[PDB]
Amino acid sequence: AARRIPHFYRVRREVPRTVNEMKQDFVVTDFYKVGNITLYTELHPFFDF
Amino acid sequence: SLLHTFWRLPVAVFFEPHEENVLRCPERVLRRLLEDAAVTM
Amino acid sequence: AVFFEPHEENVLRCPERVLRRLLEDAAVTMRGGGWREDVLMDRVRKRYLRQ
Amino acid sequence: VDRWIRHAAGVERPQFGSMSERNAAATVHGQKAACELI
Amino acid sequence: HRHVVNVVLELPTEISEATHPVLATMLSKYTRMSSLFNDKCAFKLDLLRMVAVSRTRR
Amino acid sequence: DYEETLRLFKTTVTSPNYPELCYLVDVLVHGNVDAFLLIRTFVARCIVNMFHTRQLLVFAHSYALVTLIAEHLADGALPPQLLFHYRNLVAVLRLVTRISALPGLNNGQLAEEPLSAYVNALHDHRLWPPFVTHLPRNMEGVQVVADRQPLNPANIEARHHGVSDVPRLGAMDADEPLFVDDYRATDDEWTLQKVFYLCLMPAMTNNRACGLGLNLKTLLVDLFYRPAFLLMPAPEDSIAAQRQAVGEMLTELVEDVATDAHTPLLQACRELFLAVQFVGEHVKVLEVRAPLDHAQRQGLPDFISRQHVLYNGCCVVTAPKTLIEYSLPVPFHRFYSNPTICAALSDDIKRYVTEFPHYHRHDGGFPLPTAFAHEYHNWLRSPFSRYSATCPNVLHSVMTLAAMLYKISPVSLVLQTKAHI
Amino acid sequence: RISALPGLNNGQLAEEPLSAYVNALHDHRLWPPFVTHLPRNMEGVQVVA
Amino acid sequence: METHLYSDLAFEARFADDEQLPLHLVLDQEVLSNEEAETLRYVYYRNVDSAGRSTGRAPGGDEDDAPASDDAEDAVGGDRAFDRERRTWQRACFRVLPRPLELLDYLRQSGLTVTLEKEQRVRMFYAVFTTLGLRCPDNRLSGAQTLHLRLVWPDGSYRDWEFLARDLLREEMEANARTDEWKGAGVSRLREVWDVQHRVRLRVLWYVNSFWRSRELSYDDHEVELYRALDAYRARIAVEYVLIRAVRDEIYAVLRRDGGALPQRFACHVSRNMSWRVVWELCRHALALWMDWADVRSCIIKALTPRLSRGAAAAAQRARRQRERSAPKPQELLFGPRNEPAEQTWYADVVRCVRAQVDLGVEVRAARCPRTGLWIVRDRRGRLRRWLSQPEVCVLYVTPDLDFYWVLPGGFAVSSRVTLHGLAQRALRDRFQNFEAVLARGMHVEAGRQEPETPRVSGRRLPF
Q1: Would you call H21 helix, strand, or coil by DSSP?
Q2: How far is CA H213 from the centre of its chain?
Q3: What is the full DSSP assignment across F51-71?
Q4: How far apart (Å, rounded) are the C-alpha atoms in residues F277 and E48?
Q5: How many CB atoms lie within 10 A of CB H376?
Q6: Candidate from C12, C26, C27 with C-beta closest to H262
Q7: Can you give the C-alpha Rg of chain D in angstroms?
Q8: I need a labelling partner for G28 at 20 to 30 A (CA). Which of A10, E35, F236, F286 fits?
């Protein structure tokens, strides 16, 4: 891996945005709205389903 | 290199998840992949 | 837009036959070495050489 | 830009008039309306 | 001795084994490891750390 | 009151005129005490002359250079305000490790772990800081994986200084052997290092920092290979004589940071050359594998934790201008992955950024390599990066980076409610 | 930093980034009135003298 | 404690026929996960000699040569060899303590008296107790003997750990009411031992009051016997990888046989103006990357696993007998009963050259679609998985038979077979023969019904 770090970036593709990062672009007052997508993965305060 | 088809005329589709479409990588992405396969080894 | 339909008779011809020559020349340089048995075998034999 | 607006609004793709907005699952408040003037 | 200096270490001719005694001690420690003589940089760092650790006041 | 020290820290980390030999000297010295006592006067002049010509502080970026200065330069080698800054920085570290645990409710152990090791992850020994120097004394549960298998056999670590062991130098880039300095890191300095690389750095850099890897073995064969270091008594006609003797690299590298009126260039170069014998290795990113403690092991008992840390490296704050030929950039954690530094260092990452310009961000959204993208296996998920983006440069931001690390174990619930928190 | 919206911008719509739409200070259509080096991407802008 | 003493007296009981000496073992979280330990059904273990055949089969020769015969009706040799392979393994005793513990502490809580040379604080996450009896043929014992372990979960899965007996008896033979005396004497030492592949270590116990200590066997480890025992272990491992070799040379043969103009056998829309020189070049670069990532967990191994079953061979003969019949006569259709291949489970190798992440085991349900439908590959949920649209993939398809498809993107395919004739038979079974279900606690008596919940002797509850 220590040599293949620049080998990861030779390919010019982007990585898709994961689900936990998609839980952070919502303001504290609209996270409960239906416009949110990732509420079906919010199931328990102690885990990340 | 070019395929030998059966129908003389191509048709259109409707982008279902049922009809098996061909890839959408017009001119830049395939050059990117050939440069990728060149620099992978 | 512009798409052909999946018949049976539609094929893919040879890519100007030099790339298939490159597949054969890849096979003849693949044939010498790369068994993946020998790496496991010299691993376990150096393990039993070290014990 | 269209396939990103619809995923930012939640609405569906374009599939005398018709029943476009099908009725909700349950209702305790009756019917609704709210229009707009920019 | 002369081999590990000339083809492996690539040292200039102005310094020899007489003016530098630490290298003269290190010839017999180099020659017992005939392998890794394709590697030349690690031997250079070995000589560098030996001449650095020799020139201390303790 | 620690506002002046934190303000000096803010103006010395984010500033793009950091001296380049600072990153060299930490991977040169590895925090070894007897190694650092050789370079004591050199570090003293490197503090005072650079501080008088440039108002920023030196050696703030690496942890081991801070406590070593605050301990073994206490003999009045510096002006008192500089050592007051370093003492206040280590006092900030002790203040924020006073807060992270609960001192009102910690006495006695529980299933071989201390009671404080459950209430907060910042005291737990399964957590590893992203730039680790020594090896910790507590490795009972945690396994370290180098290439394929964990190195729980305790016989693939040994190193000796002075006997000049060439096989570790030849296979330095080989990854299955690694070489520790055989000094186990006890728990207090382990906690302090974890704080200094998880709270005080990313709250004060806003993830502008990055990690690089100095190809040191190739760097030494053309830096100290001039005979002016080889032929030394155990000239000074002109300055250009010394410049021709020591080579062009050290003349633009050590131009003002160690050149004084009392000490010349070449004598200071010999003073730095004094401690090359503690050479270390190449940078190797380490993936630890640690199951949780017995309180948290109730649900999902087979959940292992991926956590990528780095060995023998440097946490840098800007792009080095002249070390670009012997440096390898390593974005490995969600902290210290800034595409400005990687784009100024490498060429392919700069191509990746100039192809996808929106990936120039700082809040962890920069794509890590897929050897490191286990976002549902790390200990520090994306809200930590999201908070460290928009955090102010205040001591309380470091305090909330400490207090956001309270564990969610049942006994941590019991502890942190029994203080009415 | 205050020009773009760092909590929300990632992905893209055209090959211009998503931050190039929310502000005028992040797209190459707007040129600064004192230019010394010509910019990188001119896929939409054609220059005229 | 519970299984060690009982199986010690049981091997003392059964020592006369097969001279099996006990090996009292415990495992940990390095061997398997906690979830895997909570539902481990039963354990199988096999004694295999230095010559490397078995302890169940015949001493000289077997009816397990004549390498593969490449058939469908017998398809290994028939089920007599399956009966043989069932007779190789033995079902040893078994006990799980799924709770964190210290081992010497636990033997102190029982009646056992522990004394080691130096205190080794061992602390693991659970405990599973297992005893193994390696069979010395004479009174003497060969050092290059090797063992096998099989761990069976009720889904039908298995894991094979193999190691020599040389590391088990290295230090031990060099230094060398009954239930009341056994606790009073107790253990002498604790020793961890890795396997032959160094992927898992496990701890063994040694009691001084065992009947192993009074047998006075002889131990020798000759180097030419170690040389051949690794050679027998070479062919045991090689049964998985030279099969992958047999797939690759088949592709290079048929492509030289065809001449480079390969047809389509899969339903994909295509585009003529798209270049194909880029597509052919990504065939060669990705085909070697599949060989770089070959593993036992692959599609072509999962294709064989239903064929090496009990009722596979007779049902395969029933398949062709239903096909190879006459058309139904006019007297048949009016008064005979109603006469009965809609979709089949295919396994898939998905390789991807853009990111070098290759997926090995994939369930695919594929069927003939109408209107001269070549082939269409759906998921288990009708998802119509649509990887073969993209330019970045290449995919390999296998059947439950030995039919074989290598498919290019755009759905263009290479139709060939799978040749296994170079592979011998006795190593083809013992790697991946489908073993049968043996009845245990909570199992229905009749063959298959609505099965109840798992036993799950776990630590979250009390035992009761």
Answers
A1: strand
A2: 35
A3: HHHSSS-SS-S-SHHHHHHHH
A4: 8
A5: 18
A6: C12
A7: 14
A8: A10
Q: What is the DSSP string of C12-41?
A: E--STTHHHHHHHHHHHHHSSS--SHHHHH
Pairing of strands F184-185, F135-136: parallel
Beta-bridged to residue F310, according to DSSP, are F131, F285
**Cβ <8 Å between H252 and C51:** no
| Closest to F130 (Cα-Cα) out of F391, F392, F362, F314 | F314
F46, two tokens: 């490197």
Q: Which amino acid is at F330?
A: V
- With a CB cutoff of 8 Å and minimum separation 6, the contacts of H282 are B33, B34, B37, H353, H391, H394, H409
Type and span of the H or E element at F287: strand F284-289
Nearest CA of chain G to the CA of A13: how many Å?
12
Alpha-carbon distance A4 to nearest alpha carbon in chain F (angstroms) = 9
Q: Does B32 touch chain A (CB under 8 A)?
A: yes
Residue with tokens 């203080």: F419
> What are the distances in angstroms from CA H11 to CA F349, H26, H149?
65, 18, 18
User: How many angstroms separate the CA atoms of F331 and F209, rounded?
Assistant: 10
Q: Chain H contacts of F140, Cβ < 8 Å?
A: 123
- Classified as helix, coil or strand, H142 is strand
Contact present, A and F (at least 3 Cβ pairs less than 8 Å): yes
Q: List the alpha helices (DSSP H) in F206-278.
A: 216-223, 227-230, 239-246, 248-253, 265-273
Look at residue H413 and give its three-state secondary structure. Answer: strand
Among chain B residues, CA nearest to C19: B1
The Cα–Cα gap between F368 and A5 comes to 9
Report how far residue C49's alpha carbon sits from residue H318's, in angstroms, rounded to the nearest whole number.
53
Whole-angstrom Cα distance, residue H182 to residue H112? Answer: 8
Across the interface, of C3, C11, C16, the residue whose CB is closest to B22 is C3
Q: Which amino acid is at F221?
A: V
Query: Residue F17 and residue F319: Cα distance in Å, rounded?
Result: 9
Contact F228/E at CB under 8 A: no
Q: Helices H277-292 and H223-258 meet at what angle, rounded to 10?
A: 170
Rounded CA separation H208/F342 (Å): 63
Among left, alpha and beta (phi > 0; psi -120 to 50; other), residue F76 is left
Phi, psi of A17 (to 5 degrees): -70, 125
Contact A25 G8 (CB under 8 A): yes
Alpha-carbon gap, residue H346 to H404, rounded angstroms: 10
Resolution of the structure in the document, Å: 4.1
Those residues of chain B whose CB sits closer than 8 Å to some CB in chain H are 1-3, 5, 10, 13, 17-23, 25, 29-30, 33-34, 36-37, 40-41
Q: Which residues of A touch F381 (CB under 8 A)?
A: 20, 48
Question: Are H307 and H74 within 8 A, CB to CB?
Answer: no
Angstrom distance (rounded) from CA H24 to CA F184: 36
**Pair type for strands H42-48 and H90-92:** antiparallel
Chains interfacing with C (3 or more CB pairs < 8 Å): B, H
Tokens at residue H77, please? Answer: 């040799």
Please list the alpha-helical segments (H only) found in F326-391: 339-345, 348-355, 382-389
* DSSP, residue by residue, F157-219: ----SSS--HHHHHTSS-SS-----S-EE-HHHHHHHHHIIIIIHHHHHTT--EEEEE-HHHH
Paired sense of beta strands H201-207 and H219-220, if any:
unpaired
For F365, other C-beta atoms within 10 Å of its C-beta total: 26
Please give the Cα distance from H229 to H226 (Å, whole number): 5
Sequence letter at residue F19: P
